[PDB]
Amino acid sequence: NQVAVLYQDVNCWRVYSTGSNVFQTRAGCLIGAE
Amino acid sequence: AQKFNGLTVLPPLLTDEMIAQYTSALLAGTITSGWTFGAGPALQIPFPMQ
Ligand SMILES: *[C@@H]1O[C@H](CO)[C@@H](O)[C@H](O)[C@H]1NC(C)=O
Numbered sequence: 001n002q003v004a005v006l007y008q009d010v011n012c013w014r015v016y017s018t019g020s021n022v023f024q025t026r027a028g029c030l031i032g033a034e
Numbered sequence: 035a036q037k038f039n040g041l042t043v044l045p046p047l048l049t050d051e052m053i054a055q056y057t058s059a060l061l062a063g064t065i066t067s068g069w070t071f072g073a074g075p076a077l078q079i080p081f082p083m084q
Contacts, residue, residue, distance in 0.1 A: 008042065027045055 004032030 007015065012022060012029030023030050067076035068084045 002032075004030065006030050 006027070007029050008027075010029050012018070012024055012031070015029070015031075018031055021031060021034055023033065063071045063076060065081070066078055068079050070077045070079075
């Protein structure tokens, strides 16, 4: 039941609720994976 | 620029650097092993005889 979220075009830091395990890719920013 | 209204572009799955690798692989096989690598393992053969 674990998931992950991808944000389309953000410089991840307009995101509101973020903890650890952040990562920025060419497509966007992804939180929930290492 | 300025993204106008709510329209996006999205990126392709395979980047251009990876595509160039695939074409280079085909050149190596046909120069060295002829057409043998299209079916089963590759076998070497001298070019003038090929
Ligand atoms: C994103 O933020 C970093 C640090 O705030 C900045 O250096 C960069 O220019 C910004 N934009 C992109 C596309 O990385």
